[PDB]
Structures are given as structure tokens and as C-alpha cells.
């Protein structure tokens, strides 16, 4: 009953609240020679255009 009452706008708001321009936590196991470092990953959670 609560699952058919969700609005697309509400879902977009929830997605924007917690993803956009937020600090993530990364865990890596393996060849870290090729996996990007945190700083770069922190700079791609937002876009210049927005």
C-alpha cells in the first residue's frame, strides 16, 4: 500500500538529497594501481552545469 503511493518527484528528491555533492566512502580490494583515488571521486559527485 505504501509502495504505490510513492511519487516520482519524491524519489528524485530523495536521490538528490543523499547523492548530489556528498562525501562517499570507498572500499577497494585488488590492483589499486588503476582504481581512481578518493580526491578524484569526490570531484565527480557534482557537475558544472548542475
Amino acid at each position: 500500500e505504501q509502495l504505490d503511493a510513492i511519487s516520482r518527484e519524491d524519489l528524485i528528491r530523495v536521490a538528490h538529497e543523499y547523492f548530489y555533492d556528498k562525501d562517499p566512502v570507498v572500499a577497494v580490494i585488488g590492483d589499486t594501481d588503476n582504481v581512481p583515488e578518493y580526491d578524484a571521486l569526490r570531484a565527480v559527485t557534482y557537475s558544472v552545469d548542475l
Binding site: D23, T32, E37, Y38, R42
Partner: protein
């Protein structure tokens, strides 16, 4: 960044890395004040010690050259005051 001399050196010398764990905090969770005054104090102590060590040959040579400079200056003053030039 590949096809570079330092990458080639890494691959030739260092082994295939294994058993290293790195923990990084985001800069937003680290206070810039942080370890600030302690680092200032201890780095200043270290630099004072190091410069006291490696500056003493320069101090000794400077003392000798200052002695020579004083001698030459007084000699030239005597020469000019006596019309001996």
C-alpha cells in the same frame, strides 16, 4: 602516466605489491587547525638544529673573510688619508 621512466623503474625494481592497507579521510572531515601548532613548533626546532649544524663552516669562513675585509678597509683608509695612492 604509463610509458614513463619512473613507471618503468617501479616495474623493474619493486615487486608485485601485496598486503598494504591505506586509510584516507575526506578533507571535509579533517580540521585544518589539526596538528598545526605542534607541527610548527617541532619543525622549527628541527630546522634550528639542522641549520646550526650545516651553517658553521660558512660561519667560520665568514669570520675569516671578515677579518681580511677589516684589514683591507683600514689599510685603504690609511693609504687615502696619507695621499699615498
Amino acid at each position: 602516466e604509463g610509458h614513463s621512466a619512473y613507471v618503468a623503474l617501479e616495474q623493474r625494481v619493486n615487486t608485485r605489491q601485496k598486503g598494504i592497507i591505506q586509510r584516507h579521510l575526506s578533507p571535509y572531515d579533517v580540521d585544518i587547525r589539526g596538528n598545526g601548532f605542534r607541527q610548527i613548533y617541532r619543525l622549527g626546532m628541527q630546522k634550528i638544529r639542522y641549520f646550526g649544524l650545516i651553517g658553521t663552516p660558512c660561519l667560520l669562513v665568514a669570520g675569516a673573510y671578515r677579518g681580511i675585509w677589516v684589514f683591507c678597509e683600514r689599510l685603504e683608509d690609511e693609504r687615502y688619508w696619507s695621499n699615498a695612492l
